[PDB]
Design a binder for this molecule. Sequence first.
Ligand SMILES: [Mg+2]
Lengths: 50, 780, 236
Amino acid sequence: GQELNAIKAALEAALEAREKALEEAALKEALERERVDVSLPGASLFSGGL
Amino acid sequence: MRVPFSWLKAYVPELESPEVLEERLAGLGFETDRIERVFPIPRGVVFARVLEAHPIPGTRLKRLVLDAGRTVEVVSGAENARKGIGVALALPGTELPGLGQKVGERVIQGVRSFGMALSPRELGVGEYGGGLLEFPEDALPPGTPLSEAWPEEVVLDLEVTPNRPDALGLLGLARDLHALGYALVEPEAALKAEALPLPFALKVEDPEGAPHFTLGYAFGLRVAPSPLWMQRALFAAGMRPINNVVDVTNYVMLERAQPMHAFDLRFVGEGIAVRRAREGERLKTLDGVERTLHPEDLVIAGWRGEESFPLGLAGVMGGAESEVREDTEAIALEVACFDPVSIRKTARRHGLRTEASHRFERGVDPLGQVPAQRRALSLLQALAGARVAEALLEAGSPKPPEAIPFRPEYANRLLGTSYPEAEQIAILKRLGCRVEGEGPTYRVTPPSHRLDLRLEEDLVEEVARIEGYETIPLALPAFFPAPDNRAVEAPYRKEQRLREVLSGLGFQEVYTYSFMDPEDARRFRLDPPRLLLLNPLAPEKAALRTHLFPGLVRVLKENLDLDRPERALLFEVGRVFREREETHLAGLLFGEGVGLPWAKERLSGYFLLKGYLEALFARLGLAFRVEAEAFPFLHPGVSGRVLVEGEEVGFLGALHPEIAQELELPPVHLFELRLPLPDKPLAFQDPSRHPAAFRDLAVVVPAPTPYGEVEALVREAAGPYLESLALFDLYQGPPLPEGHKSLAFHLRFRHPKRTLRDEEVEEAVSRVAEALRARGFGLR
Amino acid sequence: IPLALPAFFPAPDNRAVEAPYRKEQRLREVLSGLGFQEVYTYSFMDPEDARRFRLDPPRLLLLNPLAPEKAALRTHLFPGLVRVLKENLDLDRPERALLFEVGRVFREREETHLAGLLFGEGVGLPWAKERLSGYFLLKGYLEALFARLGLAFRVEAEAFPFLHPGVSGRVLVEGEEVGFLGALHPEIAQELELPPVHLFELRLPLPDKPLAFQDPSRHPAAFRDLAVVVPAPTPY
RNA sequence: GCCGAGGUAGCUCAGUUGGUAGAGCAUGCGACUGAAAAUCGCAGUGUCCGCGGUUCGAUUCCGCGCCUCGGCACCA
Ligand SMILES: [Mg+2]
């Protein structure tokens, strides 16, 4: 039970903590960093016609 | 429906072969799913006569002494094994299909068993294996090979469409083959009745459920097994013989599609009462199944004095208790027409599907009961040596079919054929109609059994088929369509072109189930579906999609998991649901991007898509621009709405990071407009042949401002003579204030008739600088 | 005389007679897809251009030309595609241009041709100087093109008297050679006072590959990288 | 609406004297490269369908309902 305990007491606390920790660390950099002027001209692919 | 060739050939004597019959039934309106030979019985199986059945002490087995030409014994654990019946004796050295290893002399519990007495499964005539076959003890001379009296049969598997319940009876089916010119042989129920009173009374209490209900009376019955021809016939049709009486009921049923059932009078009481089950009442049907009854079930009950008990689930399946057995001498024969809906309901309510209900659901001859009673009563008299009574017990007086106005002129008009009147009237008369007519429009009244003939169009169909659809000639109609039909196909050619155009640029088309996972409503942050299902293939497919991307994206994940597309530009046009069904176009970009297979320099992401998209509507000659808008499913940093020809119709951005993270997906971009796209009529406009005065000019602007507002303003005040515009560079650098950026535009002016003087352009380039100031922008 | 409409089944040797047509049409439509602007150009040819673009003189000439400039019948589509360019850049100054033309050429036999033409800054970002263009931009579209048609495509350097020796090869559709792809010979651009330019001119009808469906395996694809040191002169 | 079988790591899936929840490409840092790859340790995104149990990490007894299938009864 010492392990039955620690095996649970650790896996859940640890593995998930680190996750959600970065789940809110990485997903945080983007949200802030990535800011574009959407209404800005984009790549100039050609446009045909007949 | 299983159709035993030879059984049919008994009514239709001159049939060519199982093959031709299928060709024939084909043109008649019935296709055969399969054909198959059925009773391969080795020379090793003979008929034998159970002289005596001796119980082997200590066992549950029996030593049978059989007259198999000479005398032999056999051991058998079959309950039904008794003295005085015939059996299918498989002699030692016989190869049985149903049990493959070679039968032989074997000692069992002390007796030299000389081969074994077969069972339905063991002979290969039926799936039953809980007893031996039971032949009439005098069936054949002891020892004669069984095949000699049980030839290989051929069974066709016919699809019988709902408009032909008359066809769930071979004699009915036969009537169609007749119309093609085949001789028809109807059995002549040869009754020898006796004018005497019936020991029971009828009391139909729900004439609504039993529109027509007749009871027969056969007594002094001698129950025994059926002759071989009967047993053989029933088996080929997918049914298992059970005796004298019970078998004739099933035989007739299959023959003329009229379910019937012999109730044993010992149980009938005073009389038979056709009523509804008293909410509560219990009944144990033939299948051994003990059931409870919903007060809506139409029951066939009996009453005794002041009592009333159920005897059978009317039209569906008889009751276990009153079934006829060997010790029965008199019966009450049920032959009725039951309300199709009542049966349907009940049948399913109890999860039952019988040959009986199946027919009563589809439809029974409203006036074919009585003829049926005689056919059964006759046969009972001939195989059970019964003494049939003379009077029946009727309840209900159905009205024969009405006349149908039939003009062979129209038949030929509607078919594009020119069948001579004569052939038509002739045919109709072969199918049993009464053609009381003089011409040109006859009074055709069909046979009580044709439920599928009410209209004059129904009749014309009868000619085409009996005459052969292959006789209707080919043709092509020529006419000018009514005016409100001109251009009705614009909406279509429009969208189609669309797809075609997309497929041009580089988009890969994709179709995705209209279904939506209610969960994705949260998973992609959308509003829950308004239209859901009451019977989803799976909760995952429980609702109706409100967007096209959730799917476009999912098909992506699914791709990257089976294969790992390095990149992917996709699109889908489909119907979305929400308040109203509406067509949508969806796109999706993802991966490295567009560039050089080598040189790391790639061109991609948001602006790559807006790239194609601008390039897209460019092709369609339609106004397009994006204007940042919050969309619960797109990176707040890259998310706006799409504006086609000025009107908003969708969105364009990158999938919300938090989301990609859940579906464990990389970054991704998309858009989803709504169709049909705006329609700009074209106004040609001669382009001036006079040089376009063009000048550059940067505009220092605050970092938060969107390029959209800038240009909108420049072009606006830039004057009419302004030809082009363009943004050749965006600079957010050193020689500029804090939180600022410069937009350098490449303008270009031009006059229609003559060249322009720089004094004019300035008076314009200026007007652009003035409003650029009145607003709040600089001008490097 | 009243109005009417005839109704009949056409004789059998008339079934599908319009394939050749729907084929080419689709073609144009597909090109117009990617981004090519269609262009029609007089079938006439200036005998001089025979030398001006280094081509063989015309076999079919005229006995009554509208003007010596329009004295012969064109043997190629580009001389014109290019000329309509010069003429553009002179009336207006297109910053760039991707063009195409489908027309009848004459020489030994009349034959349909497809011609293209790229020119200008290239494809990129209206701002960010980083542009994607030139020879490989065109081969870009073209590979993208036959990609759409589901047809084999590759170039193999070949000398063509009208293309930069440095950038000039033939085009191979489904294995069979049918034209060329490269940049206009510098010496030429210089005469028509034109910047650098790229083009190609295949011959129609393009090969016809019947499709053979092929279930793709649902079992993971073992994939590995590996460089190959090769001598600079060797072609990829 | 009955017998019977399967439903487990970007994927394909065996399994059961259990230390193996994994093997086969594939995938995550050092470091061999400019940029990779064949590499050596170092490791597991895995609710082994969902709600509840099960040993020291459970897949399996075991409960009912779900994605999958054969047959069956219908008939696309
Ligand atoms: Mg009909």
